[PDB]
Design a protein around this ligand. Structure first.
Ligand SMILES: O=c1[nH]c2cc(Br)ccc2n2cccc12
Ligand SMILES: [Zn+2]
Length: 207
């Protein structure tokens, strides 16, 4: 049921998605080990992901959360990187996309920093890197990220599939050492995220 629609680079919607991608790159404490060494991306394509069934699944859960939280879904746009991006956009988020060993428990993880999600494109810790060259810092191979609509509801703040903490709908991982890191978030129900944009890109080698 999924259709992908290409956005033109001249479309303001392409341009606002690209700007969120580029502007939320940061340096990482692994010195690039997981995701590669770069300061910016070459964006190759941005597609809108359309699936009526998955969208309705998302909005149904969104209303349930809103009604549990004084009519406030606390909806964000967040990045998600995964070797399973193709199953996600076709069949939706579920248990198979959860991070069993995650430091906030076995939920599905999202990030404000696109470069954090980039570290997961080839798996946990960047796995063995790109399939072609076995390079976590490959500048040639095309990578993909999702830019997702996520319902946080009442989020449990951690300074630093399972269930979220009693009385909450998500967990927020607040950056507490690295003053430049943005927040990361975890949801415990696949229905609390919708993959809105599929972004195809390369990381760029700094000059
Ligand atoms: O975009 C992300 N994808 C992930 C995929 C797996 Br699988 C495990 C963890 C993350 N993760 C943690 C922070 C951000 C992300
Ligand atoms: Zn490669």
């Amino acid at each position: 049921g999924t259709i992908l629609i290409d956005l033109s680079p001249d479309d303001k919607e392409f341009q606002s998605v690209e700007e969120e991608m580029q502007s939320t790159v940061r340096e990482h404490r692994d010195g690039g080990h997981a995701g590669g060494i770069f300061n910016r991306y070459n964006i190759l394509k941005i597609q809108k992901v359309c699936n009526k069934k998955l969208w309705e699944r998302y909005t149904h859960r969104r209303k349930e959360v809103s009604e549990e939280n004084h009519n406030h879904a606390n909806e964000r746009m967040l990045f998600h990187g995964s070797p399973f991006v193709n199953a996600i956009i076709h069949k939706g988020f579920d248990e198979r996309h959860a991070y069993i060993g995650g430091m906030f428990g076995a939920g599905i993880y999202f990030a404000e920093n696109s470069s954090k999600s980039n570290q997961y494109v080839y798996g946990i810790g960047g796995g063995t890197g790109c399939p072609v060259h076995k390079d976590r810092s490959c500048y040639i191979c095309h990578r993909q990220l999702l830019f997702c609509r996520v319902t946080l509801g009442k989020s449990f703040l951690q300074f630093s599939m399972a269930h979220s903490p009693p009385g909450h709908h998500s967990v927020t991982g607040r950056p507490s050492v690295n003053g430049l890191a943005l927040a990361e978030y975890v949801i415990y129900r696949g229905e609390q995220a919708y993959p809105e944009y599929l972004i195809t890109y390369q990381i760029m080698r700094p000059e």
